Amino acid sequence: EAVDQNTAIVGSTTGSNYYVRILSTIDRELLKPNASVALHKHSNALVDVLPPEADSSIMMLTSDQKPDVMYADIGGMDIQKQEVREAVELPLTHFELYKQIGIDPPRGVLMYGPPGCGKTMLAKAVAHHTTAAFIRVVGSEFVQKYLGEGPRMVRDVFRLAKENAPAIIFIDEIDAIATKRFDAQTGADREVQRILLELLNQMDGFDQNVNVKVIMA
Amino acid sequence: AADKQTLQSEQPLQVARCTKIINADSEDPKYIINVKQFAKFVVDLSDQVAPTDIEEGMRVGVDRNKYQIHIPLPPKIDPTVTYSDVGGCKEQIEKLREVVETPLLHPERFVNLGIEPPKGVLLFGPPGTGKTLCARAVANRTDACFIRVIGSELVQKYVGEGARMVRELFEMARTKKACLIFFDEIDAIGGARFDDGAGGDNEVQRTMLELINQLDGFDPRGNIKVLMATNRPDTLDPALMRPGRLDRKIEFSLPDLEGRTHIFKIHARSMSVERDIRFELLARLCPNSTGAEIRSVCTEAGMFAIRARRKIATEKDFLEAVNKVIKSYAKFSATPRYMTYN
Amino acid sequence: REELQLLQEQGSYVGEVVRAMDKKKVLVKVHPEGKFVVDVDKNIDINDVTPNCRVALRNDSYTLHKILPNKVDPLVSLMMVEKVPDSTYEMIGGLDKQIKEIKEVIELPVKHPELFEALGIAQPKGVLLYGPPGTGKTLLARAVAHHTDCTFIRVSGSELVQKFIGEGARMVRELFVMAREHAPSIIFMDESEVQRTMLELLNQLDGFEATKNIKVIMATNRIDILDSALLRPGRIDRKIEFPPPNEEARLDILKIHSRKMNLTRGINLRKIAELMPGASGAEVKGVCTEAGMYALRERRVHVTQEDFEMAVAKVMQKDSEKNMSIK
Amino acid sequence: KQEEERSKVDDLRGTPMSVGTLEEIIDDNHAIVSTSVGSEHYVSILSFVDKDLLEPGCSVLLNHKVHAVIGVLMDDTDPLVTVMKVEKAPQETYADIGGLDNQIQEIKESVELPLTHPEYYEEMGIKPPKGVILYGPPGTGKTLLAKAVANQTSATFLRVVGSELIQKYLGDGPKLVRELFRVAEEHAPSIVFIDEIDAIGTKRYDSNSGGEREIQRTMLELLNQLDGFDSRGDVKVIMATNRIETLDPALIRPGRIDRKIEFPLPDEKTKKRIFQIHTSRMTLADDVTLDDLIMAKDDLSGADIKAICTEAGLMALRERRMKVTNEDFKKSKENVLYKKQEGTPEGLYL
Numbered sequence A: 001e002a003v004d005q006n007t008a009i010v011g012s013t014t015g016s017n018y019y020v021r022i023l024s025t026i027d028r029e030l031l032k033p034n035a036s037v038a039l040h041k042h043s044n045a046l047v048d049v050l051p052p053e054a055d056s057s058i059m060m061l062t063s064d065q066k067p068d069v070m071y072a073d074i075g076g077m078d079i080q081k082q083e084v085r086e087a088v089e090l091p092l093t094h095f096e097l098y099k100q101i102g103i104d105p106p107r108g109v110l111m112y113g114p115p116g117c118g119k120t121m122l123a124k125a126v127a128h129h130t131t132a133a134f135i136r137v138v139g140s141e142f143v144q145k146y147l148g149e150g151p152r153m154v155r156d157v158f159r160l161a162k163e164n165a166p167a168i169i170f171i172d173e174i175d176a177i178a179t180k181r182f183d184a185q186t187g188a189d190r191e192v193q194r195i196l197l198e199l200l201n202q203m204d205g206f207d208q209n210v211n212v213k214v215i216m217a
Numbered sequence B: 001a002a003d004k005q006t007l008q009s010e011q012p013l014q015v016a017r018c019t020k021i022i023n024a025d026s027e028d029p030k031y032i033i034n035v036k037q038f039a040k041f042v043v044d045l046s047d048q049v050a051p052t053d054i055e056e057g058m059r060v061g062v063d064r065n066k067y068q069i070h071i072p073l074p075p076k077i078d079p080t081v082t083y084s085d086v087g088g089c090k091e092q093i094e095k096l097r098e099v100v101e102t103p104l105l106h107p108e109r110f111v112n113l114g115i116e117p118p119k120g121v122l123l124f125g126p127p128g129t130g131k132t133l134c135a136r137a138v139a140n141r142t143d144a145c146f147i148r149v150i151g152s153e154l155v156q157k158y159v160g161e162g163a164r165m166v167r168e169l170f171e172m173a174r175t176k177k178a179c180l181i182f183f184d185e186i187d188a189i190g191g192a193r194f195d196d197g198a199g200g201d202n203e204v205q206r207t208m209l210e211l212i213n214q215l216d217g218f219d220p221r222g223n224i225k226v227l228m229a230t231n232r233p234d235t236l237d238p239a240l241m242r243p244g245r246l247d248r249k250i251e252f253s254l255p256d257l258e259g260r261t262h263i264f265k266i267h268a269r270s271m272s273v274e275r276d277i278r279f280e281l282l283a284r285l286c287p288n289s290t291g292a293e294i295r296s297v298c299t300e301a302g303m304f305a306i307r308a309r310r311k312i313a314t315e316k317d318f319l320e321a322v323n324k325v326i327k328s329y330a331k332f333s334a335t336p337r338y339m340t341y342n
Numbered sequence C: 001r002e003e004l005q006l007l008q009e010q011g012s013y014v015g016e017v018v019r020a021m022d023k024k025k026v027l028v029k030v031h032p033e034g035k036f037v038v039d040v041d042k043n044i045d046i047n048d049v050t051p052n053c054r055v056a057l058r059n060d061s062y063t064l065h066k067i068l069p070n071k072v073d074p075l076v077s078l079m080m081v082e083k084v085p086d087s088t089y090e091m092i093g094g095l096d097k098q099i100k101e102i103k104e105v106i107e108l109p110v111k112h113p114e115l116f117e118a119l120g121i122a123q124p125k126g127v128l129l130y131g132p133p134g135t136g137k138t139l140l141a142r143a144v145a146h147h148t149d150c151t152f153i154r155v156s157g158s159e160l161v162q163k164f165i166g167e168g169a170r171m172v173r174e175l176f177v178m179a180r181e182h183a184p185s186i187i188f189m190d191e192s193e194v195q196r197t198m199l200e201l202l203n204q205l206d207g208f209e210a211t212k213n214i215k216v217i218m219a220t221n222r223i224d225i226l227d228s229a230l231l232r233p234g235r236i237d238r239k240i241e242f243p244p245p246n247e248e249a250r251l252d253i254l255k256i257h258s259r260k261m262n263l264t265r266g267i268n269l270r271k272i273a274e275l276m277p278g279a280s281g282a283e284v285k286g287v288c289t290e291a292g293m294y295a296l297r298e299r300r301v302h303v304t305q306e307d308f309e310m311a312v313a314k315v316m317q318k319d320s321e322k323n324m325s326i327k
Numbered sequence D: 001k002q003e004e005e006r007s008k009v010d011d012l013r014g015t016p017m018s019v020g021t022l023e024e025i026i027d028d029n030h031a032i033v034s035t036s037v038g039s040e041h042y043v044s045i046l047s048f049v050d051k052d053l054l055e056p057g058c059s060v061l062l063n064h065k066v067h068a069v070i071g072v073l074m075d076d077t078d079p080l081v082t083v084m085k086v087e088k089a090p091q092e093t094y095a096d097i098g099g100l101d102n103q104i105q106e107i108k109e110s111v112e113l114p115l116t117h118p119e120y121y122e123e124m125g126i127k128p129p130k131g132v133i134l135y136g137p138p139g140t141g142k143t144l145l146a147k148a149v150a151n152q153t154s155a156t157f158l159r160v161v162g163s164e165l166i167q168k169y170l171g172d173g174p175k176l177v178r179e180l181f182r183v184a185e186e187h188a189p190s191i192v193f194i195d196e197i198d199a200i201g202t203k204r205y206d207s208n209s210g211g212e213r214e215i216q217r218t219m220l221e222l223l224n225q226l227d228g229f230d231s232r233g234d235v236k237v238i239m240a241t242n243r244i245e246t247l248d249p250a251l252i253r254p255g256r257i258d259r260k261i262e263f264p265l266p267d268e269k270t271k272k273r274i275f276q277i278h279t280s281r282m283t284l285a286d287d288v289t290l291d292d293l294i295m296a297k298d299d300l301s302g303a304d305i306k307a308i309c310t311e312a313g314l315m316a317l318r319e320r321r322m323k324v325t326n327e328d329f330k331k332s333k334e335n336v337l338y339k340k341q342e343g344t345p346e347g348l349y350l
């Protein structure tokens, strides 16, 4: 927070909190959130402010690690393939075919089937075809020690997501981290509770322009 | 300002950080210290101290700049440690008479027959049964002496502090003749050497080793006897089940009926009742109970004797006392209320 | 600009004063640290020491130097979380007696505090709008308390249930400082620091309130079986459920989510609402979207009724399955 | 003069001054000081302040640079003592006899009569009850009967909530136990009341240190202080809960807590009086029969009756009606209980 003209309060990554005289260099409104700011080693004063931060631990693979798979490269997933195309790529260009009919933008999706139907293969191909910023994570690293840790992971993904674009961002896990059993005080209940409440409370029903189709399977 | 000038002379005289001792090397002082919070350290001393008294389980003076050892003391001390009716259980005091009284009376039956004197007992029985009474009922005949020690009194948060109180109890034991420390809850004191790669509840471990050391072996006991109480001979050590230490295992359990009549005598005579009443009917009304609960019964007949102004307890006072405790306070009131029987 | 060697000594931090005492000393308890008693500067008073107001402690000799406003500061961290200005009344259609209950519990303390305070007590504080999550409950509550426009600032109060609540929260009453300095606002929550925060709610909302009850609301799912130390009737006054919406409400929401579409004349919506089994709020919207998807795969601009019926066949079948009527 | 001696004591002090928690007497006036974080040189004490005000191991005024003891701590006005030390003997002994009458007699001849006349144990050689857990279903009268004995008294009453002892600092709660039992020691013959200590066992926080290793230490200080040593004598302490599952049995055992007292949710023969008295101070269309409400809820507490008898009047006065219709009682009771499910089962005895 800021007390007055060009003098403010910053916490730090050193552990404690400080109250600092800040320069006239940074524009007087660039300090609304707890934004990534720069201080001095010795004498602790603001020099610059960086608005984004916090990549998602691999950050989208960035270049090439799309497994190079086409539509017909998939052997036989035609309803899942075809409908994912209908609900991913056709919305991505034709926002207005959803306007002259008047329908909705998209959200996540659910898959199922026996182990060995090429379950990640569709995600491989749709990552290959697209243009967007395919941020991926996986599920079973969500179960972690500190308070709201995986919840902080989900919000890092969402804040970075809304920072980039409503482009396409991806998660692939449903099973055994988010079962429907809310009601058991049986182990890691802080973690089970924060995962379930995080999934629902960041689901929110909608965010409406972000993170196209978290595919769960 | 009664000493203010000398306080302006102690400003160049200041040393000795707290720094509890973990352990040492051999052949040399070479001790090992954690401070409190930071780290660990393998230390060596300043020269003008005694390397003798820097033993394990202690917190020494330590320099700021060189961490060299300065004078210890015990900086963790003193708040650390919190018979006419001889005749309770019957077959027990006689084995008590044996294992305590017969070494403390004659080395005639023992050394001449070629046996060692039985010095320790493993009591076992449910709680509320009179381990405390028989323990202290030893101390009519010895001289007068007794000390009582619960096991979980030694749950204090420093290494060897419990071992330091083992030092304290064994060096108070030899000061006095024919004395009785009592032990209880000897499971948390430790009989089983549970270990995997954790390094946790180890003050118990080294305290238990200190217990085996000072207990039996290396100048044995003499005119000191100590009873150990439990519900189990199951969670002990085979190093005090070393067959010449704790070898009797006096048994008792819930009293029969007549034991409860005797406890009725005991907690009838020591309070304000009338001397015209019986107790065997009450003894029938207590199929499974303890003499501690007989104390509760007598104090509850005293509660009825408070309710009305009664110092001469009727039979009805103890009737409604037992009816209170075993049927109207066992859980609420309503396990009876059907005939089917009478 | 030459003054900026003043920068070069002191990041003189925010100080934490419980209260002052006599003899020109205070009690500063520094931000992750302990009690350090010191002397004060000359340009602020012992009189200027407000109870639990932060100060600007220089760290030269811990000279108590300046006193700083804004009084808590995890505060705007929560005040920069609410920020959902949603839509209007006409896309609600059917929980209308619940809207009149929302009138009774919310809008009358907005309009007339002393027509319930003329009765002699405080006002109700919650409705516990439980049910299947997402019947438009967001849409309902956020819209109807959106049009009051200045008396509902939906904190959401539990999004980091482990980090907003206790990990920076004093005794989460930064929320209550918000409730008092934004006296027209409303607190919205989800689900033992939660239990401690319940106990400070009970320190406040048990008849000890500045700005009238404010309006603390949580709505749970899956079965109302949280820990029952919250569930005494003198902890949450009213309790309102959300039934599955009926043929009238499905018809009304069907007109709602069909209106904006490119419409074909000659349709019967009641038929579609009769086919629906009373699902929880907006499978109306599911049928509308999947009929738009059938129009998307095909190429049309008129959305006839048979397209909606194919979407009914998509998102109404399973549940299905007969040779099972028995009962 | 005195001014120069005072100034020299003030300049023995170095203006950044500090505070640390102690352990033990070091009898010859050189000391050693833990801080919060405990860095402990062989310190002195500024020898004009009284070292012997205080027992071993308590906060004093320290220095930052040579760490030396400077002054006695301030008698720190924590938010507890204003609540712990009960100011007035408030109200509400018995506005209305006929709520319990079973353990009113019990709490009387177990708390008043041993204490207020400590001469019956002279005759009969009996020890007083030190701790009695009054417990039962939520909304019975435990807090009420606590206030009842708190006004109807001749002893300095004390009232403690169980979440008062829960602060995030290290050793804070044990110090609060220390000052708590100083308050329990240094008034009078006193009646301490403790409430909500079943809300302390399966309980962990975020404004907190290592959870199971924090209030284990605090409740262990309670253990070592309450009915340990520091001779009991005549100090009345009453603890109250709703449930018993999270209770460590180390405190439930005798020596520490003698009598165990439940409370039944009452019979209809007293429900008629409790419903009447909760409806005694309002206007009501007297044709309506509370015997429906009295017979209906099979495990009612009195908070149920409280919320019913007030909320029916609230539903009537909601539309400004002085007197209450029976379907306003319907609306009231079906608000108050979530799913008023006491009909069949049963219902069909019948």
Ligand SMILES: Nc1ncnc2c1ncn2[C@@H]1O[C@H](COP(=O)(O)OP(=O)(O)OP(O)(O)=S)[C@@H](O)[C@H]1O
Pocket (backbone or CB within 6 Å): A074, A075, A076, A113, A114, A115, A116, A117, A118, A119, A120, A121, A122
């Ligand atoms: N239909 C298919 N025909 C041929 N090869 C396939 C097919 N599906 C999968 N594969 C092979 O398996 C890889 C992808 O399989 P996955 O998509 O990972 O299946 P899966 O996800 O491991 O199954 P799950 O997730 O455990 S249910 C491809 O790179 C191919 O080598």
Ligand SMILES: Nc1ncnc2c1ncn2[C@@H]1O[C@H](COP(=O)(O)OP(=O)(O)OP(O)(O)=S)[C@@H](O)[C@H]1O
Pocket (backbone or CB within 6 Å): B087, B088, B089, B126, B127, B128, B129, B130, B131, B132, B133, B184, B229, B255, B259, B263, B266, B290, B291, B292, B293, B295
């Ligand atoms: N066999 C007995 N004969 C006489 N009095 C008895 C007997 N058993 C119990 N009592 C009485 O009940 C009390 C039992 O409580 P204590 O012995 O003081 O504690 P305790 O629970 O027995 O100790 P532990 O658990 O056995 S080590 C005795 O002090 C006597 O007052």
Ligand SMILES: Nc1ncnc2c1ncn2[C@@H]1O[C@H](COP(=O)(O)OP(=O)(O)OP(O)(O)=S)[C@@H](O)[C@H]1O
Pocket (backbone or CB within 6 Å): C232, D093, D094, D095, D096, D097, D098, D099, D100, D137, D138, D139, D140, D141, D142, D143, D144, D241, D242, D274, D301, D302, D303, D304, D305, D306
């Ligand atoms: N004079 C009285 N005699 C008998 N009962 C009364 C009397 N006055 C009030 N009551 C009842 O006693 C109840 C007291 O409620 P409490 O015991 O305080 O509820 P509670 O605080 O939730 O208890 P907890 O859950 O253990 S904190 C009221 O709800 C009344 O119905």
